Structure formats: structure tokens, C-alpha cells
Amino acid sequence: NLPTAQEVQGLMARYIELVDVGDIEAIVQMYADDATVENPFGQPPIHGREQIAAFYRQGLGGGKVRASLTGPVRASHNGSGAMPCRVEMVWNGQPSALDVIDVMRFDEHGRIQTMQAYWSEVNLSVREP
Amino acid sequence: NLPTAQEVQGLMARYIELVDVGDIEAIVQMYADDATVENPFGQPPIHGREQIAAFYRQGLGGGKVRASLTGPVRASHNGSGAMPCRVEMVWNGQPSALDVIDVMRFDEHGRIQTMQAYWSEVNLSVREP
Ligand SMILES: C[C@]12CCc3c(ccc4cc(O)ccc34)[C@@H]1CCC2=O
Ligand SMILES: C[C@]12CCc3c(ccc4cc(O)ccc34)[C@@H]1CCC2=O
């Protein structure tokens, strides 16, 4: 069925673990084949697993990116949820920390149907030498 | 124009301060007149300043509620934002805390057009002596 509030907490938390180790295949596996991703939210969406794979491929590939949950996954009873997290990566040649909040909606199959990542430069922190 | 990312950070943070002191009148003024609220997200929406004011009236009235930002407001460049916060209130006779994530979309006037609060009982913590 549609993931319960507790299942969602578990799914969204796993998601972060997978991004953290850059397991693109396992990441794409969590998505629905016609899922849509907005990241950063505000930018035109990307549709389908293929473009979504391509996104995580270039986003987590080449660079050195880590990500961690920085708080509890908030979860509703309609297969949706929202989490706070921190993405570490090189931004403009310098290591930086990015504060993000992802909102996910899941389908009756436990897969991500909608994904929106709220962040921008105001949330970017460059790590000084 | 549509609030810049930095303006979005200011608006949403101010909103929490307003909720915190129970200023229903200032709160409502932040909302567009035909704004929609889904709180909790998953439940049927309420539309319009009149029903929104009634919602905050009963939500913040009678009870003794507190709210505080527990992390940075994540803001996009297209007039949206999400924030983590902590709401304190009396639940089932006992003081409790609720972990919430609010997502808001503002209109070109800087007023809240759309609001969704993500939380369920899995985000509820009853507080000992
Ligand atoms: C895309 C990115 C790496 C991965 C990533 C970013 C931002 C938000 C994210 C949200 C996610 O749920 C998963 C990965 C990212 C970074 C912003 C700049 C960049 O290097
Ligand atoms: C409504 C409420 C008090 C206020 C409140 C709750 C939940 C989410 C909120 C989100 C807000 O942005 C502002 C206020 C609340 C509580 C749920 C139970 C209750 O006591």
C-alpha cells in the first residue's frame, strides 16, 4: 500500500544514506519510472528515471559529495514527507556545506513519485582553510 | 516582485516569531486573501483568510503553544521556502513537542499563497517532568 508515516521516515532516511555513498543505481531504484525531480526547487523539473539517473550521475559523479540527515524526517499519512539535511561538496573549487530540505511523495509501491529539494546560495557555506 | 531567496528567509522566520507569540492578526496579514493551507499536509485544505484565521484562532487560542526555528530557512529563487521548526503544546493533557517542516510559496506581493506543514504523530514527543 501507500507507505505509512513510519515507512516514509525509513525510506527518506535510506535515500540520504544512498546519496551519501553515491550509489546511483540504488538511488534510481528508489524512484518511480515516471517520477519527477525538482532540484533546486524553482528550476524546471526533470522527468523519468533516465533523466533522473543522468542527474544523479553528474551531480554525484566526478565530485566528492557527502550528505547526512541533520534532523528527523517529518512524515504525513499520505505517503509524503520532508527532511532537513546537509550536503558537503566542492563548490567553486572550495569545499562547501549546503543546507537542504527535500520533500518527497511516494506511490503505492513505496517508490518516489515526486521529489523537491529546497536550497539556494543563501544556504551555501564555504569552509575556510 | 516575487520574494528573493533572502526575502523568503526573512518572511518565513518572521512567521514563526508571530506564531510563537500567538499574533493571529499579524499572521493572517502574511497570507494572501485566497491562500490555501494544508496543516497537516495530507488533510483537506482550508482556503481563504477567513478560514485560515479561524484555524490559527483555535490552533493558537486556548492552548499554550510555542514555536521556534530549529535550523536555517531553505529558500529557492522562485519565491518558495521550507523550514524545520519545533512546536510546543499540551497534547493529551501533557506538555509535548512536535517536529514540523513548513513549506511555503509566496506570491508576487510577498504574501503566502500556499502553505503545507509536514508532521504526524511519528513526530510527536511527550515531555517528562
Ligand atoms: C547537486 C549538488 C550535489 C548533490 C546535491 C546538491 C544539492 C541538493 C541535493 C539534494 C539531494 O536530495 C541529493 C543531492 C543533492 C548539490 C548542489 C550542487 C551540487 O554539487
Ligand atoms: C495545531 C497545533 C498547535 C499549532 C500547530 C500544530 C502543528 C503544526 C503547526 C504548524 C504551524 O506552522 C503553526 C502551528 C502549528 C499543532 C498540532 C496540534 C496543535 O496543538
Swiss-Prot record, chains A, B:
EC number, UniProt record: 5.3.3.1
Name the consequence of D102E. Answer: Slightly reduces activity. Reduces activity 10000-fold
| Biological process, per Gene Ontology | steroid metabolic process
Q: What keywords appear on the UniProt entry?
A: Isomerase, Lipid metabolism, Steroid metabolism
Question: Does the record carry Isomerase as a key word?
Answer: yes
Pfam assignment, any one: SnoaL_2
- Describe what upregulates or represses it: By steroids.
- Put simply, this protein is called Steroid Delta-isomerase
Gene of this entry: ksi
